[PDB]
DNA sequence: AGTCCACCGGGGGACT
DNA sequence: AGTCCCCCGGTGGACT
């Protein structure tokens, strides 16, 4: 569970526990002797629990140590059962950390679409717990689903036919140079009409269990190949923490997809941003005021909306919901 | 040494030495016991060294060996003085690898560009080791200045005042949109030397290897050239990066379009050429990664790559011998 | 198996 | 001293 529990650590099979031995079974060209089971950590840490959406204290508890909990509960189950030789890199943490913030913020906008779409389906507005309700007029045209994109996505692939179509005319009158895509962590898409009455797209999940992994993390697949341009809302950056070297893969992919999206494809603005706990060294801030270097070319906005800091958990859901209440105002009903 | 001696260690001060003990004087927020003292060591590693142009021997070894060094021999040090004790951080031989690399590759091209500058001068190509004589005609203003930019720069500062306004003024465009345009750096810089110092001899002579004074000069040399630089004179940048990820290929990607944005798009500038350097790049994706098309002139331009290679040197010759033909190369639009 | 992907935190030094 | 900069290697998991 979120707080630790000598009980429920016992009663974890080995194949669940959160620290794994591979002293005796190891990985090649890797020393790697105990491994950080970060899919087990977020069933331990989150299987019940969803920040944001949870106990009045989790909520509104500092979302650093939210996100740092699963890897604190792993370390003491570790040091339960190898007391000399627990021993870590702090490689090991920094991946499982990052993923886990990508992870558990994913999963707190899966909930709120889901509140949000149940309120533009024609139920009510959920108030376990309460938020502000938003003052957009309901449609089903105006539902969403939030995408957590794996690693080695290529974000084209959203995109309907036709269009990833006009993106090929215009990139095969360009080749030993050519102009590939990668993606964001996170894309949020205007649901398809096929799907504005499917029942899953209202459902908030109970905790970050091994088959909800699954659900928010397949998630995209069914959108594969049905998403117009104007309908990508949002892209996401989850970075934990920041280092200025660490800035640039949002600011070139925001670039790219404005390019492609707003230049070849006459999409609106694309909203780009980016999410840290740890900003150090402001330039940041400063670097993410970048022009849209495509925008530049035409005759002018961002490529990079906002740099934005997450305080508590329930934070993160207030401005998601105003994003929505905004942004779906442009979507007709 | 290259190669480690104790007897070169025990003659070391101990403010020279490779690793600080700093147990007892701990880093505010910070649990670093020794720390990696990486000017020493690029000192006692490579203070009579410049791969290329050492020994055959090392000129030809794997570069991957050569640049690992610095970090070996403080290793073998740490261990002598503290033995059980000596522990250092994975993020401290990473960092201090990597810095490596920009300052040795750095230093090859710096001689690399020595050598040029006296052919191109009346003198001579001096013969050891021996490497192709470049064909291009010779001419005092086809030399080259390779400038070591450090963290924190602004390439623009390079430039000429007259191209800082017409970017100045650019800027100012965006500002009263609440937007900008940041520039930042690349690591290295091959600029035109400028008339002025075209005469001037510190840069036709090759150091003998990385003591702390040639460290200073080769890192200190931006200075001599800030404010001189035109657009079209800026002709080779380049950005090292030891090993890659696919999250770590972007600041090069980035800055070659920004760069190239305000050199071609706003200066009238020709194509800016921007290469990335690596000893590992775990596949094949970043060179596909780095064929993107420079993106402002996608937007009546001839199109070409934003980073026009990622170059992979195999051993220090071959880093040399790549920059000995660019030049020779490049640097003919440029009239003798 | 192997091979790819992309996570980020501990750093040495410049500058103040 | 305190603050900032930009360095990269060891990773857990998807895929085959
Ligand atoms: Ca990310
Ligand atoms: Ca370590
Ligand atoms: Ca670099």
Redesign the pocket.
Known sequence: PFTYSIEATRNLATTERCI?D?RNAP????????????????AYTFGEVIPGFASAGINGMDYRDVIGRPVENAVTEGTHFFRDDF?????????????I??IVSSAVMWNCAARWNSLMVGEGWRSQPRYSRPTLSPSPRRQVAVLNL????DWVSLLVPESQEVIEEFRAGLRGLGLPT??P?LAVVVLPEEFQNDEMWREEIAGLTRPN??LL?GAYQRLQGRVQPGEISLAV??????????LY?PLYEANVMQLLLEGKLGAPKVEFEVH???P?????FVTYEAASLYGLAEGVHRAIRELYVPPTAADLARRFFAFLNERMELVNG
């Open positions: 794994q591979i990985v090649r060209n890797r020393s790697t002797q105990f491994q950080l089971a970060q899919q087990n950590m977020l021993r870590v890199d702090s490689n090991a943490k920094a991946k499982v950390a990052g993923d913030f990508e794996p690693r080695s996505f990668s993606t962590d992994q699954i993390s950056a989850f970075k934990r923490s920041l280092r200025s070297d660490r893969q840290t706990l740890a150090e060294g402001t330039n940041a």
